[PDB]
Amino acid sequence: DHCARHGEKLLLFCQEDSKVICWLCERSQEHRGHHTFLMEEVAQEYHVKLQTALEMLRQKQQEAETERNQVAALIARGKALGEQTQYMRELISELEHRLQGSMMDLLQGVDGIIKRIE
Amino acid sequence: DHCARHGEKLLLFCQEDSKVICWLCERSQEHRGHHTFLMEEVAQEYHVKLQTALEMLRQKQQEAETERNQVAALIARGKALGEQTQYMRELISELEHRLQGSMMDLLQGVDGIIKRIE
Amino acid sequence: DHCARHGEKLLLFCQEDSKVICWLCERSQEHRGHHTFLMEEVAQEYHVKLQTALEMLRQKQQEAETERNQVAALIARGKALGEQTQYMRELISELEHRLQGSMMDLLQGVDGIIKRIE
Ligand SMILES: [Zn+2]
Ligand SMILES: [Zn+2]
Ligand SMILES: [Zn+2]
Ligand SMILES: [Zn+2]
Ligand SMILES: [Zn+2]
Ligand SMILES: [Zn+2]
């Protein structure tokens, strides 16, 4: 891909901004001093973490459905378990989208995703 | 633009040499250790200084014309004031040319321009 | 030339790996922290050292052939002198190959060559 501001290849990844950028972006005062990595290397790095969180979330979801079934203030526990199961469902959806997308789609905003997991 | 020595894009600016260069030029022993910036950032920086110097030079020119008019060894002061008015006349033209030109045309040799102002 | 891993130009030279690489290779964890130079400058630098070592090795070889001829445990000295003359023959051949080859072929493994000279 190519940068909107500069038109150069998007091969670097800024951690603080959690945003893909080119070298010229790295040298500007906007991203000056930040820590920047190679897009491919960080892509391999985060892909594993989001996959792991995907398996963990799937297990937790199966357990949540089992618990919700067995429950059938038990009603309150059922409701809260339902809302939680929904939130997890959406999270899993986003993780699958990122894992099947391009490296840029995966990295852009990964900080927010990992914050959401925790 | 493209580099004569290397053929790469001219996107960096070396302060010590006050010359626009590419990354390969930055990494050579010729410009090794110098401080280099992004052409756009230093372009915005110097544009303001040459604009300010433009206003200042215009004021000094108006005042010079007023003084020369009122003078009309006062004659010697008239002649010298005339020569000065000529030099400034050229300087203002150069400042407008640079300010209305591209970033490269503005930065190339700006050191000599600012040296001329002072 | 172009990089196998990344497809970018091979314009840099890693001293530790004594290997020509592109910028992306420089920023990977593989070559992170290493000392990297411009390929052309180090090529011009090493060309002179291998040329000097070439002349020196040629002189030493002529002297070695003269000594081996004059020898005709002197026999043991003849044998060892012969083996040495062979090793030098191969070294000189490699030096000529590198000096007439491309910058990459010259630099790739130059550390091993200079170690072989000594
Ligand atoms: Zn950019
Ligand atoms: Zn940044
Ligand atoms: Zn250059
Ligand atoms: Zn310089
Ligand atoms: Zn590479
Ligand atoms: Zn290396």
Author numbering:
A (entry chain B), B (entry chain D), C (entry chain A): 95 to 166, 179 to 224
Give excerpts from the publication.
TRIM5α is a restriction factor that intercepts the incoming capsids of diverse retroviruses, including HIV-1, and inhibits viral replication. Like all TRIM proteins, TRIM5α consists of an N-terminal tripartite or RBCC motif (RING, B-box 2, and coiled-coil domains), followed by a C-terminal domain.
A P212121 crystal contained two trimers in the asymmetric unit (3.26 Å resolution, R/Rfree = 0.26/0.30), a C2 form contained one dimer (2.1 Å, R/Rfree = 0.18/0.22), and a P1 form contained two dimers (2.3 Å, R/Rfree = 0.22/0.26). As expected, the trimerization interactions are principally mediated by the B-box domain, burying 578 Å2 of the available surface area from each subunit. The B-box packs against the N-terminal end of the coiled-coil helix through a hydrophobic interface (asterisks), suggesting that trimer formation requires the presence of the coiled-coil. Comparison of the trimer and dimer bonding interactions revealed that the two oligomers are distinguished primarily by intermolecular packing between the Trp117, Leu118, and Leu132 sidechains in the hydrophobic layer. In particular, Leu118 and Leu132, which are located at the outer edges of the binding surface, are in van der Waals contact in the trimer, but more separated in the dimer. Nevertheless, it seems clear that the B-box trimer is what facilitates hexagonal lattice assembly, at least in vitro.
